[PDB]
Amino acid sequence: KYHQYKINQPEYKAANGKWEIIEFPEKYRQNTIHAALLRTGKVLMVAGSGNNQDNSDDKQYDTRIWDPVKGTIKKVPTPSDLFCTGHTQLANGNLLIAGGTKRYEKLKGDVTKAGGLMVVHNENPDKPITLPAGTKFTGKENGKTFVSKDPVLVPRAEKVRNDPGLGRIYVEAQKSGSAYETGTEDNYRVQGLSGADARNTYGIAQKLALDKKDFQGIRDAFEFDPVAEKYIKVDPMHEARWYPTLTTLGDGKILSVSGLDDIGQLVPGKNEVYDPKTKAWTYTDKVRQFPTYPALFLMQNGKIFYSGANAGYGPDDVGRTPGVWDVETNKFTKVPGMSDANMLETANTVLLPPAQDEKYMVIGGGGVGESKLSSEKTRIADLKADDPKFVDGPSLEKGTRYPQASILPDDSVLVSGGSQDYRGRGDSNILQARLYHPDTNEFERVADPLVGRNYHSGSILLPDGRLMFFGSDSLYADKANTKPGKFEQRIEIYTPPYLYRDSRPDLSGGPQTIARGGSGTFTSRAASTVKKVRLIRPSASTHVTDVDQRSIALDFKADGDKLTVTVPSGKNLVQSGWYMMFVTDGEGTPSKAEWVRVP
Numbered sequence: 001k002y003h004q005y006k007i008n009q010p011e012y013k014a015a016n017g018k019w020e021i022i023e024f025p026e027k028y029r030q031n032t033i034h035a036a037l038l039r040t041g042k043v044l045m046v047a048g049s050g051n052n053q054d055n056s057d058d059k060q061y062d063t064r065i066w067d068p069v070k071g072t073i074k075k076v077p078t079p080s081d082l083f084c085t086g087h088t089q090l091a092n093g094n095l096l097i098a099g100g101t102k103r104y105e106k107l108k109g110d111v112t113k114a115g116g117l118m119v120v121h122n123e124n125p126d127k128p129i130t131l132p133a134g135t136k137f138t139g140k141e142n143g144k145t146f147v148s149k150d151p152v153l154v155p156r157a158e159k160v161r162n163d164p165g166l167g168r169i170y171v172e173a174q175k176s177g178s179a180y181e182t183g184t185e186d187n188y189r190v191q192g193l194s195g196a197d198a199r200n201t202y203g204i205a206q207k208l209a210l211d212k213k214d215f216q217g218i219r220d221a222f223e224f225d226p227v228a229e230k231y232i233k234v235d236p237m238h239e240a241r242w243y244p245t246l247t248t249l250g251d252g253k254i255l256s257v258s259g260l261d262d263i264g265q266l267v268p269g270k271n272e273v274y275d276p277k278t279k280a281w282t283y284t285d286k287v288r289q290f291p292t293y294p295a296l297f298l299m300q301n302g303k304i305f306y307s308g309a310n311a312g313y314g315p316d317d318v319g320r321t322p323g324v325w326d327v328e329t330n331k332f333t334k335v336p337g338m339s340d341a342n343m344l345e346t347a348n349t350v351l352l353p354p355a356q357d358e359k360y361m362v363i364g365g366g367g368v369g370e371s372k373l374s375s376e377k378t379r380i381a382d383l384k385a386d387d388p389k390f391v392d393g394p395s396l397e398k399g400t401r402y403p404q405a406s407i408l409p410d411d412s413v414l415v416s417g418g419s420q421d422y423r424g425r426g427d428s429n430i431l432q433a434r435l436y437h438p439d440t441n442e443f444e445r446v447a448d449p450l451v452g453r454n455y456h457s458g459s460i461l462l463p464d465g466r467l468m469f470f471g472s473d474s475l476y477a478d479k480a481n482t483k484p485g486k487f488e489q490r491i492e493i494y495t496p497p498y499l500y501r502d503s504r505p506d507l508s509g510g511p512q513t514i515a516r517g518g519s520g521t522f523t524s525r526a527a528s529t530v531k532k533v534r535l536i537r538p539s540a541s542t543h544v545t546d547v548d549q550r551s552i553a554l555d556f557k558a559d560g561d562k563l564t565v566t567v568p569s570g571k572n573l574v575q576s577g578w579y580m581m582f583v584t585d586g587e588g589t590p591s592k593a594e595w596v597r598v599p
């Protein structure tokens with residue numbers, strides 16, 4: 001339009017950057033749900049079956065590697081249905097990817113009525129129990145009632161605790177509409193049982209709502225080798241997990257937390273650790289339950305910070321409170337102050353730059369399950385404070401689920417997209433982007449994104465300083481919510497303001513390996529202009545969750561055209577692995593990254 005003229009003016013791009021749509025040849029398209037920047041500089045894009053029933057039925061599983069410099073894309077053979085998986089970079093630079101989705105069950109019953117899977121428990125070792133069709137289950141907390149359509153046989157408990165018999169049955173609300181939906185797990189009383197039967201028999205269900213498909217986890221785990229460009233099978237997890245968080249501990253092992261299991265129950269706090277040297281998994285000694293994709297970050301004291309951000313599931317009163325988790329002792333200490341604590345599902349979490357400060361920001365979020373509630377708020381916790389607590393930061397304009405959030409090499413945080421309602425319901429994509437500035441605690445609006453991104457989206461900082469945005473899985477295609485949504489297969493590249501100004505500093509000397517506490521030397525003719533150096537861990541982003549990205553400040557010295565940088569000593573700050581190293585000048589303009597390996 002004229003718009004298009006406005007947003008291409010030198011002054012405009014200099015203050016707001018600019019967006020571009022990339023669309024791939026039809027043959028390379030997929031529903032990208034997970035992405036990660038690899039140490040090769042290319043982006044792993046993982047769809048699995050892509051939340052597509054035909055692909056699940058055909059075992060059609062997709063992965064791409066996309067080269068942002070050349071703009072080329074290739075397919076990668078994908079061994080398991082690796083969407084709704086967990087993932088993080090290993091010390092060797094491989095991406096550990098574990099969990100994912102079992103072949104999906106057909107959705108049954110009336111599309112206008114809340115329902116889903118009820119898992120019936122039988123505590124009686126003496127006898128099985130059959131609940132006939134039309135059995136009513138009522139939530140002990142939520143008070144809502146659902147009815148089975150078919151009989152279910154629930155086998156005897158087995159003695160060992162008795163281990164309860166379990167039987168799965170579809171249940172459905174009596175009347176249509178969202179008034180009769182639930183958003184969290186509850187324990188359901190079975191109406192019309194008396195005595196012993198009532199004592200030994202009960203239901204557990206996750207959300208029983210209108211986006212109805214029932215998903216189960218798988219145990220498979222792989223290392224993605226970015227040099228070979230292949231998935232390498234490693235030992236499977238002990239637990240099947242759909243939506244686990246994988247997060248690096250102090251000793252370099254990977255902790256896997258939560259997820260739904262092979263029958264769709266929340267894994268009840270049975271966490272496990274991958275040792276990259278043995279390529280084997282071990283249960284943790286002690287149990288702690290969280291909802292799915294919990295946002296879990298390694299702190300400099302070796303404990304885990306849980307921000308409260310999560311993708312849902314489980315009860316509303318277990319693992320819903322932000323805090324500090326000592327994995328070895330299992331002590332959990334609440335961090336108070338969170339505003340809109342009822343709107344933490346589908347929020348983003350960022351460890352603010354520089355990571356040395358241990359400040360976490362929680363952005364946006366929505367009510368449990370398919371709630372119409374959404375939060376405009378940011379909330380910041382400083383974990384180095386005497387009494388740590390969340391305090392509100394700058395607000396967004398609109399309540400926003402699913403905001404994308406990426407650390408930039410200038411210490412800004414790009415916060416972009418999202419939607420006002422569940423899965424972009426009511427055509428509620430928010431086509432806005434901001435820079436968050438940590439030092440001022442201010443938001444600055446920048447250019448609007450071109451493509452809406454809600455559920456199943458993400459963003460990835462690239463070595464050249466641009467950012468890639470992917471995904472978006474709207475429930476509906478139309479504002480009226482009458483037709484099924486189509487998965488967004490375009491990506492965008494966002495060029496920030498800092499690339500529309502003066503010449504950027506030059507940098508060469510990579511790739512290099514630099515130990516914690518060690519130093520390395522790089523070349524920059526513009527060394528004298530460098531104000532900061534940042535070692536930035538590449539992102540692995542899914543479901544509004546990225547426990548990989550962090551930006552570590554490096555001390556440096558300039559000596560003519562030579563920059564000597566020093567890596568901090570702590571293994572809890574500087575996780576082993578590969579990092580982008582950016583140098584930024586006093587005008588805030590970053591170099592392109594060189595890659596550095598920390599052993």
Ligand SMILES: [Cu+2]
Pocket residue numbers: 084456543
């Ligand atoms: Cu998902």
